[PDB]
Amino acid sequence: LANGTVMSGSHWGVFTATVENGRATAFTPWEKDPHPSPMLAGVLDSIYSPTRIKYPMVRREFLEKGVNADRSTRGNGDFVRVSWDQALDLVAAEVKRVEETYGPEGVFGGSYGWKSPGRLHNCTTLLRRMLTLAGGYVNGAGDYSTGAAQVIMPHVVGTLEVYEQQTAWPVLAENTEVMVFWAADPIKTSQIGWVIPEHGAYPGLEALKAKGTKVIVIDPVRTKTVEFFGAEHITPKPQTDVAIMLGMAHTLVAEDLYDKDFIANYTSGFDKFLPYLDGETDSTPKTAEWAEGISGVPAETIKELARLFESKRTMLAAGWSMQRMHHGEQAHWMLVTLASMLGQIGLPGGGFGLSYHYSGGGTPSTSGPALAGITDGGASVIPVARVVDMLENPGAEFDFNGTRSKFPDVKMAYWVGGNPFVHHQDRNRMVKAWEKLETFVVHDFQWTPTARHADIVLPATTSYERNDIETIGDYSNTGILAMKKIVEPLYEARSDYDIFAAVAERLGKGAEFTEGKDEMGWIKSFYDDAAKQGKAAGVQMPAFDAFWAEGIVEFPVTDGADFVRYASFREDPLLNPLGTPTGLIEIYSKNIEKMGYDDCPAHPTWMEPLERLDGPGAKYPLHIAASHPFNRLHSQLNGTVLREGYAVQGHEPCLMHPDDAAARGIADGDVVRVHNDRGQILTGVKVTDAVMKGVIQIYEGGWYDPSDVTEPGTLDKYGDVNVLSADIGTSKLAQGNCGQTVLAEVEKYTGPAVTLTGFVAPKAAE
Ligand SMILES: NC1=NC(=O)C2=N[C@H]3C(S)=C(S)[C@@H](COP(=O)(O)OP(=O)(O)OC[C@H]4O[C@@H](n5cnc6c(=O)[nH]c(N)nc65)[C@H](O)[C@@H]4O)O[C@H]3NC2=N1
Ligand SMILES: NC1=NC(=O)C2=N[C@H]3C(S)=C(S)[C@@H](COP(=O)(O)OP(=O)(O)OC[C@H]4O[C@@H](n5cnc6c(=O)[nH]c(N)nc65)[C@H](O)[C@@H]4O)O[C@H]3NC2=N1
């Protein structure tokens, strides 16, 4: 039994593991990590927690009756343990059956999810690689993060923008006078990376602070970002940012402050937006006063913020919560319009950036090569959050970015690396729609709500039980890490690659799936390709064994630290045009105009959302800020020792303002029921003035624990906030999710005592 230390990586960062007698006993942060995440101790625990999945299992009803099984009991925990050969045979037959009876349109393989980093052990790509050899599948398009903004940005600035490099942090420290964080909490969200994180935002934030730059935070909650800087804190009613923006815009026009030359030379359509802004088209001048009526931010503050932004070198750094909402396309389009008026786009330290809060955006990029991994070998496509509408309406038409298509008639869904029974909106509607699927197959290493609702569950390994390779730094490209195997696979878990190879072998496509390569065979070909490309560029890299032995290769920064977004566009717009039809920033879009969608007009517009705090005729009184957890990565690590540090009487915490608690007779630590017309959950309250009055904070990612899966509307005992959200599209343009457009009521829970069952394994899988 192994004794020693191994260096690996994860979504939380690079770390070294201490191994004693074959068991991992500690995870220590990399010595070069400038700001490790306290969640690493849950990462270690997730390998061994009580919800680790030990063996392959098949739902008793599915085993007994297949397609005639009662599908309303999915999630009741009545599983049967089976051997691997039996489950592999059954998965293979099911894939074959659905592909022959129904075609590629009967298999949903979008399998949305955060999985784990790794260029070889890429479970979602491997799933698509297997399914492509089986005949095809329906896929997902977009994501739950920027569903609206990633569609609107290309119409407005000609590129995706949300996942592109930002003006380097050092440039901001030298040049920015006012830094605005709009619906962004960089301190909280920069702990993680899509590939391994370098945590580059922390030194970037430290440098602004050290320089005395003025920092403003626009957020309903007083976050760690406000506290870190002692920032001026503006607290709007959630979903009213566009109103605020329009009032600022109005003020710049009324007081004649805006940059008319920038407007004239770098933008298109302002002259079509001005009438709206001034109130000629609807009789409603969008003044600061008007904006105060909707958002509750004082008129005078709105004009003061406007005047300050125009006279100082200002960076508008915006988060994505505000577009994860009804009409969410308007938030970033109005933000770019406002930035246009200020006219600082393309100057060092000015303009706007849409990725300073995620994966190190702004961290100076190196000049190293890109690393690539296994590939998938490749309506057939749906916007990802329309999964439930698809299941309910096979054959119906839907709009998406100017086109019309029809929903495929899906009969099977195969999910790996994701938790839709946590991440998707309107849990009760979803639980009923899932009955439309004949077979539901899932691989995970933790017994999440999704695993609990499968017909067939296959235990996967973590990254700590195998070898892989991955880049460090989604934007920085700081280096390449060897993700070395720390302990052996636990119980009967197997890597996703191994399971898929065995299924492909049973479909008679084994060789095509593996390409005749084993684990190290694949990893070395990704490395050799990256070294070959590096040599071409003049970056020297060791040979593979030398690399593997050191465990990491770092790259040099040459001019990456001088990067300024949009500089060449500002420098000469004709020579360096945007990808838009006019080549300019499009305030009014003729392209959007021609689609003629009522919920997405051709210029940024204030529109009432489905439900909003203090909106006319609103039924519920509190906005739920259903934002990202501080101490989880979505649902990951919920079933670990970290839960004990935030849970209130065992439930997911609910933050509530002293006055809202006082009005309902609630005291700190009480168990309360949060409910609206879509569902009802239990949470434990923390009374704090960190949330503005009218707002409550329930993070997304809580593990759904239904009291009874056969009872429609059954009470969730843990606190999955997606039990209360609605499942609707941002608009016909993007069809994004509206996960944070949520109102509810809260009362002291006075029903029967409840026993939590989500943090232990189903009895048969013990
Ligand atoms: N109401 C609401 N508000 C929101 O802000 C919100 N945010 C959304 C966002 S932006 C997104 S990205 C989604 C994220 O939702 P997503 O389903 O991506 O969530 P995770 O909790 O990261 O689930 C990933 C699963 O993969 C499993 N897993 C990890 N590694 C492996 C592996 O190698 N193999 C296998 N088989 N499994 C693995 C993990 O154990 C975990 O259960 O939530 C969305 N949902 C949201 N809802
Ligand atoms: N620790 C951590 N856990 C995670 O799960 C996690 N998820 C990652 C993922 S996949 C992504 S996509 C990003 C998400 O990055 P994103 O910016 O979408 O994060 P949120 O936590 O949903 O919201 C950020 C802030 O917006 C505020 N806010 C909410 N509604 C409004 C509003 O109407 N107006 C204004 N002005 N502010 C509002 C919230 O209070 C919150 O502080 O984070 C990434 N980083 C993450 N870090």
Side-chain angles (χ1 to χ4, degrees):
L1 284 202
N3 278 294
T5 63
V6 194
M7 177 157 91
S8 191
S10 75
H11 281 316
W12 297 263
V14 172
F15 64 86
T16 290
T18 289
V19 185
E20 289 157 36
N21 274 320
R23 210 215 184 62
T25 67
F27 272 15
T28 306
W30 185 28
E31 96 212 306
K32 290 162 113 192
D33 191 330
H35 191 105
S37 190
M39 292 180 268
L40 285 169
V43 187
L44 168 62
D45 193 57
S46 73
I47 297 162
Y48 298 109
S49 83
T51 35
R52 177 72 199 254
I53 309 179
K54 296 207 194 126
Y55 321 111
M57 318 286 275
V58 177
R59 193 161 89 81
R60 167 186 294 286
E61 298 87 317
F62 177 87
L63 222 207
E64 295 190 349
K65 287 165 183 122
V67 313
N68 295 320
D70 177 7
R71 293 177 201 156
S72 84
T73 58
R74 281 203 178 111
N76 65 359
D78 171 34
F79 285 101
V80 171
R81 155 163 193 199
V82 305
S83 61
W84 271 107
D85 290 305
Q86 285 145 20
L88 292 173
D89 279 2
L90 185 70
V91 167
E94 278 293 289
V95 166
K96 200 57 206 165
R97 180 181 76 71
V98 188
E99 294 280 3
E100 308 261 57
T101 309
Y102 303 113
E105 316 87 356
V107 187
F108 186 70
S111 188
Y112 186 83
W114 262 68
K115 76 178 151 68
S116 298
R119 286 307 82 208
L120 156 77
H121 296 282
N122 192 324
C123 63
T124 53
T125 295
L126 304 152
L127 171 69
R128 290 191 266 285
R129 196 176 162 84
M130 182 278 267
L131 284 178
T132 292
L133 306 163
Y137 56 92
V138 176
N139 202 0
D143 62 57
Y144 274 88
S145 295
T146 58
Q150 69 189 230
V151 170
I152 193 66
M153 288 293 104
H155 290 290
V156 182
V157 289
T159 10
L160 204 58
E161 193 67 36
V162 296
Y163 308 132
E164 307 184 24
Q165 184 50 310
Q166 321 286 276
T167 284
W169 282 113
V171 177
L172 308 190
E174 297 316 338
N175 294 287
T176 300
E177 303 172 280
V178 181
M179 184 92 182
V180 184
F181 291 107
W182 210 315
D185 177 12
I187 293 216
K188 174 183 79 175
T189 57
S190 303
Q191 288 177 81
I192 69 98
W194 173 251
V195 294
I196 318 275
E198 83 293 89
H199 293 130
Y202 297 101
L205 298 158
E206 282 138 51
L208 302 188
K209 181 198 224 177
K211 284 259 204 191
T213 296
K214 150 134 250 186
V215 178
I216 303 154
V217 172
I218 296 167
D219 199 312
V221 169
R222 185 183 80 234
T223 58
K224 271 214 194 56
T225 294
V226 178
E227 266 143 18
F228 183 78
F229 293 106
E232 188 174 336
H233 186 204
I234 304 329
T235 69
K237 289 175 200 211
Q239 309 188 263
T240 55
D241 304 79
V242 167
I244 294 167
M245 296 173 212
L246 282 175
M248 291 167 167
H250 177 271
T251 301
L252 298 163
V253 161
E255 298 186 19
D256 208 26
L257 295 176
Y258 78 101
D259 196 328
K260 288 165 187 151
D261 295 304
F262 189 90
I263 293 294
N265 297 320
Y266 297 88
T267 73
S268 186
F270 191 71
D271 61 301
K272 277 137 166 186
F273 174 74
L274 200 61
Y276 172 65
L277 178 58
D278 285 331
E280 317 178 353
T281 60
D282 55 7
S283 307
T284 296
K286 307 310 183 299
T287 71
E289 284 78 16
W290 168 79
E292 189 189 317
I294 301 175
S295 62
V297 179
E300 265 303 317
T301 304
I302 298 178
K303 296 143 210 205
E304 256 137 43
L305 258 4
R307 285 171 201 142
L308 177 73
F309 301 159
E310 180 63 49
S311 78
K312 294 318 190 53
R313 178 70 53 77
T314 302
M315 173 52 77
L316 303 165
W320 308 324
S321 58
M322 63 174 166
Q323 59 76 80
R324 194 165 309 113
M325 291 179 175
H326 195 201
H327 302 125
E329 299 82 353
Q330 317 293 321
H332 291 90
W333 193 5
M334 185 60 222
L335 182 95
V336 170
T337 295
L338 177 67
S340 292
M341 293 188 62
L342 297 178
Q344 301 173 28
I345 293 169
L347 299 179
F352 69 87
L354 306 195
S355 189
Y356 283 112
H357 62 294
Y358 169 86
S359 297
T363 303
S365 291
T366 68
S367 75
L371 183 61
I374 205 166
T375 71
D376 54 47
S380 59
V381 181
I382 58 149
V384 290
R386 304 270 61 72
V387 70
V388 167
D389 292 328
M390 171 183 75
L391 307 174
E392 287 174 3
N393 306 287
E397 267 179 1
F398 65 92
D399 296 290
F400 176 71
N401 201 19
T403 77
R404 272 224 135 199
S405 348
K406 300 149 173 155
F407 284 118
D409 179 7
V410 160
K411 304 287 167 198
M412 162 171 150
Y414 196 141
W415 224 291
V416 298
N419 193 5
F421 281 84
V422 176
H423 79 222
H424 193 63
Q425 293 55 54
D426 193 354
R427 187 81 43 261
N428 296 311
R429 177 185 177 216
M430 163 180 185
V431 156
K432 180 63 187 303
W434 230 246
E435 290 185 27
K436 197 255 192 179
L437 295 163
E438 296 174 358
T439 313
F440 179 39
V441 188
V442 165
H443 313 170
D444 206 307
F445 48 89
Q446 286 285 313
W447 275 103
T448 65
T450 296
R452 292 185 198 261
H453 280 83
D455 285 316
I456 302 160
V457 188
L458 303 175
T461 48
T462 68
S463 316
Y464 323 119
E465 291 157 73
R466 56 197 193 228
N467 292 294
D468 212 325
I469 184 179
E470 181 66 274
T471 301
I472 301 180
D474 277 284
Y475 292 107
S476 52
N477 195 20
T478 298
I480 287 160
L481 186 68
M483 287 178 67
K484 298 176 167 170
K485 175 179 163 154
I486 302 170
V487 295
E488 298 284 334
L490 282 166
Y491 307 119
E492 303 177 15
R494 295 184 193 186
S495 76
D496 294 275
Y497 181 95
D498 285 349
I499 301 167
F500 287 128
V503 168
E505 189 63 38
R506 291 176 177 45
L507 302 174
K509 302 282 180 74
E512 289 84 353
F513 183 90
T514 71
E515 195 46 57
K517 278 183 272 226
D518 73 347
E519 184 180 76
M520 293 301 309
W522 280 114
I523 289 161
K524 167 172 200 294
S525 75
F526 313 136
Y527 184 85
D528 293 337
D529 290 359
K532 159 184 255 38
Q533 161 192 163
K535 173 199 217 177
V539 166
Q540 292 141 57
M541 284 173 57
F544 183 62
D545 255 292
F547 157 68
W548 198 260
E550 302 157 358
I552 183 178
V553 189
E554 279 164 278
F555 303 136
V557 170
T558 52
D559 57 9
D562 293 298
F563 183 70
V564 167
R565 197 178 176 72
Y566 288 104
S568 82
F569 169 72
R570 194 194 189 83
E571 224 218 311
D572 189 318
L574 298 229
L575 200 67
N576 305 284
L578 305 174
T580 54
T582 65
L584 301 173
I585 297 170
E586 289 194 13
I587 301 184
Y588 184 94
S589 172
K590 291 178 178 190
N591 238 262
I592 289 177
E593 188 196 282
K594 282 133 201 199
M595 315 172 174
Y597 288 153
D598 71 288
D599 55 9
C600 197
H603 65 76
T605 307
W606 167 256
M607 286 165 291
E608 293 283 336
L610 173 61
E611 51 187 53
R612 80 166 165 88
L613 180 58
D614 300 329
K619 176 173 174 193
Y620 292 93
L622 313 163
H623 184 87
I624 301 179
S627 73
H628 296 214
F630 204 104
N631 293 295
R632 288 188 291 273
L633 161 61
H634 303 305
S635 85
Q636 314 194 39
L637 313 188
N638 201 2
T640 68
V641 295
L642 298 181
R643 189 169 74 266
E644 178 68 28
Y646 52 73
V648 182
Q649 300 198 60
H651 314 275
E652 184 63 18
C654 179
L655 303 199
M656 148 151 65
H657 193 279
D659 295 339
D660 300 326
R664 297 161 170 79
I666 292 165
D668 195 75
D670 288 333
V671 173
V672 294
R673 194 177 73 111
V674 190
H675 59 93
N676 60 15
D677 304 330
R678 292 189 280 262
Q680 52 177 347
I681 71 190
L682 291 178
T683 56
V685 200
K686 294 195 189 96
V687 172
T688 340
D689 65 355
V691 283
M692 67 185 294
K693 166 124 147 62
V695 179
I696 56 178
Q697 187 187 270
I698 311 173
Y699 289 141
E700 56 97 343
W703 286 9
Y704 182 49
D705 190 21
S707 304
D708 183 341
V709 293
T710 67
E711 185 204 352
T714 199
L715 181 79
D716 162 24
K717 313 177 268 182
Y718 180 72
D720 169 6
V721 82
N722 279 311
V723 167
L724 305 169
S725 46
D727 188 5
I728 56 174
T730 50
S731 70
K732 297 185 193 55
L733 192 80
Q735 291 299 0
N737 72 94
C738 300
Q740 295 198 28
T741 295
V742 203
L743 301 191
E745 175 62 275
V746 178
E747 73 194 8
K748 194 167 153 170
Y749 181 61
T750 59
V754 110
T755 291
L756 285 166
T757 42
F759 307 109
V760 304
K763 268 135 201 244
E766 280 303 352

Coordinates of all heavy atoms in Angstrom, one line a residue, residues 557-589:
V557 N 5.1 34.7 -20.7 CA 4.3 35.8 -21.1 C 5.1 36.7 -22.0 O 6.1 37.2 -21.4 CB 3.8 36.7 -19.9 CG1 3.1 38.0 -20.4 CG2 2.8 35.9 -19.0
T558 N 4.8 37.0 -23.2 CA 5.5 38.0 -24.0 C 4.7 39.3 -24.1 O 4.9 40.1 -23.1 CB 5.8 37.5 -25.4 OG1 4.6 37.1 -26.0 CG2 6.8 36.4 -25.4
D559 N 3.8 39.5 -25.0 CA 3.1 40.8 -24.9 C 1.7 40.7 -24.4 O 0.9 41.7 -24.3 CB 3.0 41.4 -26.3 CG 2.3 40.5 -27.3 OD1 1.8 39.4 -27.0 OD2 2.4 40.8 -28.6
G560 N 1.3 39.5 -23.8 CA 0.0 39.3 -23.3 C -0.5 40.3 -22.2 O -1.7 40.6 -22.1
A561 N 0.4 40.9 -21.4 CA 0.1 41.8 -20.4 C -0.2 43.2 -20.9 O -0.7 44.0 -20.0 CB 1.2 42.0 -19.3
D562 N -0.1 43.6 -22.1 CA -0.5 44.8 -22.7 C -1.8 44.7 -23.5 O -2.2 45.5 -24.3 CB 0.6 45.2 -23.8 CG 1.9 45.6 -23.2 OD1 2.0 46.6 -22.4 OD2 2.9 44.9 -23.5
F563 N -2.5 43.5 -23.4 CA -3.7 43.4 -24.2 C -4.9 44.4 -23.8 O -5.3 44.5 -22.6 CB -4.2 42.0 -24.1 CG -5.4 41.8 -25.0 CD1 -5.3 42.0 -26.4 CD2 -6.7 41.6 -24.4 CE1 -6.4 41.8 -27.2 CE2 -7.8 41.5 -25.2 CZ -7.7 41.6 -26.6
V564 N -5.4 45.1 -24.7 CA -6.5 46.0 -24.6 C -7.6 45.7 -25.6 O -7.4 45.7 -26.8 CB -6.1 47.5 -24.9 CG1 -7.3 48.4 -25.0 CG2 -5.1 48.0 -23.8
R565 N -8.7 45.3 -25.0 CA -9.8 44.9 -25.9 C -10.3 46.0 -26.8 O -10.4 47.2 -26.3 CB -10.8 44.1 -25.0 CG -11.8 43.2 -25.7 CD -12.7 42.4 -24.8 NE -13.6 41.8 -25.8 CZ -13.2 40.8 -26.6 NH1 -12.1 40.2 -26.5 NH2 -14.2 40.4 -27.5
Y566 N -10.6 45.8 -28.0 CA -11.1 46.7 -29.0 C -10.2 47.9 -29.5 O -10.6 48.8 -30.2 CB -12.4 47.3 -28.5 CG -13.6 46.3 -28.5 CD1 -14.0 45.7 -27.4 CD2 -14.1 46.0 -29.8 CE1 -15.1 44.8 -27.6 CE2 -15.1 45.1 -29.9 CZ -15.6 44.5 -28.8 OH -16.6 43.6 -29.0
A567 N -8.9 47.8 -29.1 CA -8.0 48.9 -29.4 C -7.8 49.0 -31.0 O -7.9 50.1 -31.5 CB -6.6 48.6 -28.8
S568 N -7.7 47.9 -31.7 CA -7.5 48.0 -33.1 C -8.8 48.5 -33.8 O -8.6 49.3 -34.7 CB -6.9 46.8 -33.7 OG -7.9 45.8 -33.9
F569 N -10.0 48.3 -33.3 CA -11.2 48.8 -33.8 C -11.3 50.3 -33.5 O -11.7 51.1 -34.4 CB -12.4 48.2 -33.2 CG -13.8 48.8 -33.4 CD1 -14.3 48.7 -34.7 CD2 -14.5 49.4 -32.4 CE1 -15.6 49.3 -34.9 CE2 -15.7 50.0 -32.7 CZ -16.3 49.9 -33.9
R570 N -10.8 50.8 -32.4 CA -10.8 52.2 -32.1 C -9.8 52.9 -32.9 O -10.1 54.0 -33.5 CB -10.5 52.5 -30.6 CG -10.9 54.0 -30.3 CD -10.3 54.4 -28.9 NE -10.9 55.7 -28.7 CZ -12.1 56.0 -28.1 NH1 -12.9 55.1 -27.6 NH2 -12.4 57.2 -28.1
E571 N -8.7 52.3 -33.2 CA -7.6 52.8 -34.0 C -7.9 53.1 -35.4 O -7.4 54.0 -36.0 CB -6.4 51.9 -33.9 CG -5.1 52.6 -33.7 CD -4.1 51.8 -34.5 OE1 -4.1 50.6 -34.3 OE2 -3.4 52.6 -35.3
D572 N -8.7 52.3 -36.0 CA -9.1 52.4 -37.4 C -10.2 51.4 -37.7 O -10.1 50.3 -38.1 CB -7.9 52.2 -38.4 CG -8.3 52.6 -39.8 OD1 -9.4 52.3 -40.3 OD2 -7.5 53.2 -40.5
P573 N -11.5 52.0 -37.6 CA -12.7 51.2 -37.8 C -12.9 50.6 -39.2 O -13.6 49.6 -39.3 CB -13.8 52.1 -37.5 CG -13.2 53.5 -37.5 CD -11.8 53.3 -37.1
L574 N -12.4 51.3 -40.2 CA -12.6 50.8 -41.6 C -11.6 49.6 -41.9 O -12.1 48.7 -42.5 CB -12.3 51.8 -42.7 CG -13.2 53.1 -42.7 CD1 -13.6 53.2 -44.2 CD2 -14.3 53.2 -41.7
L575 N -10.4 49.8 -41.4 CA -9.4 48.8 -41.5 C -9.6 47.6 -40.6 O -9.3 46.5 -40.9 CB -8.0 49.5 -41.2 CG -6.8 48.8 -41.8 CD1 -6.8 48.9 -43.3 CD2 -5.5 49.4 -41.1
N576 N -10.3 47.9 -39.4 CA -10.5 46.8 -38.5 C -11.9 46.7 -38.0 O -12.2 46.9 -36.8 CB -9.6 46.9 -37.3 CG -8.1 47.0 -37.5 OD1 -7.5 46.0 -37.8 ND2 -7.5 48.2 -37.4
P577 N -12.9 46.5 -38.9 CA -14.3 46.4 -38.6 C -14.7 45.3 -37.8 O -14.0 44.3 -37.7 CB -14.9 46.2 -40.0 CG -13.9 45.5 -40.7 CD -12.6 46.2 -40.4
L578 N -15.9 45.5 -37.1 CA -16.5 44.4 -36.3 C -17.1 43.4 -37.3 O -17.4 43.8 -38.4 CB -17.5 45.0 -35.3 CG -16.9 46.1 -34.4 CD1 -18.0 46.7 -33.5 CD2 -15.7 45.5 -33.7
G579 N -17.5 42.3 -36.7 CA -18.2 41.3 -37.6 C -19.6 41.6 -37.8 O -20.3 40.6 -38.2
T580 N -20.2 42.7 -37.5 CA -21.6 43.0 -37.7 C -21.8 43.4 -39.2 O -20.9 43.9 -39.9 CB -22.0 44.2 -36.8 OG1 -21.1 45.3 -37.2 CG2 -22.0 43.9 -35.4
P581 N -23.1 43.4 -39.6 CA -23.4 43.8 -41.0 C -22.9 45.2 -41.4 O -22.3 45.3 -42.5 CB -24.9 43.7 -41.1 CG -25.2 42.7 -40.0 CD -24.3 42.9 -38.9
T582 N -22.9 46.2 -40.5 CA -22.4 47.5 -40.8 C -20.9 47.6 -40.5 O -20.3 48.5 -40.9 CB -23.1 48.6 -40.0 OG1 -22.8 48.5 -38.6 CG2 -24.5 48.7 -40.3
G583 N -20.3 46.7 -39.8 CA -18.9 46.7 -39.3 C -18.8 47.6 -38.1 O -17.6 47.8 -37.6
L584 N -19.9 48.1 -37.5 CA -19.9 49.0 -36.4 C -20.7 48.4 -35.2 O -21.3 47.4 -35.4 CB -20.5 50.3 -36.8 CG -19.8 51.1 -37.9 CD1 -20.6 52.3 -38.3 CD2 -18.4 51.5 -37.5
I585 N -20.7 49.1 -34.1 CA -21.4 48.6 -32.9 C -22.9 48.9 -33.2 O -23.3 50.0 -33.5 CB -21.0 49.3 -31.6 CG1 -19.5 48.9 -31.3 CG2 -21.9 49.0 -30.5 CD1 -18.9 49.7 -30.1
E586 N -23.8 47.9 -33.2 CA -25.2 48.1 -33.6 C -26.1 48.3 -32.4 O -26.7 47.4 -31.8 CB -25.5 47.0 -34.5 CG -24.8 47.2 -35.9 CD -25.3 46.4 -37.0 OE1 -26.4 45.8 -37.0 OE2 -24.6 46.3 -38.1
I587 N -26.4 49.6 -32.2 CA -27.4 50.0 -31.2 C -28.8 49.7 -31.7 O -29.7 49.2 -31.0 CB -27.2 51.5 -30.9 CG1 -25.8 51.7 -30.4 CG2 -28.2 52.0 -29.9 CD1 -25.5 53.1 -29.9
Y588 N -29.1 49.9 -33.0 CA -30.3 49.4 -33.6 C -30.0 48.3 -34.6 O -29.0 48.5 -35.4 CB -31.0 50.6 -34.4 CG -32.3 50.2 -35.0 CD1 -33.5 50.4 -34.2 CD2 -32.4 49.5 -36.2 CE1 -34.7 50.0 -34.7 CE2 -33.7 49.1 -36.7 CZ -34.8 49.4 -36.0 OH -36.0 49.0 -36.5
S589 N -30.6 47.2 -34.6 CA -30.2 46.1 -35.5 C -31.3 45.7 -36.5 O -32.4 45.3 -36.2 CB -29.8 44.9 -34.7 OG -29.6 43.8 -35.4

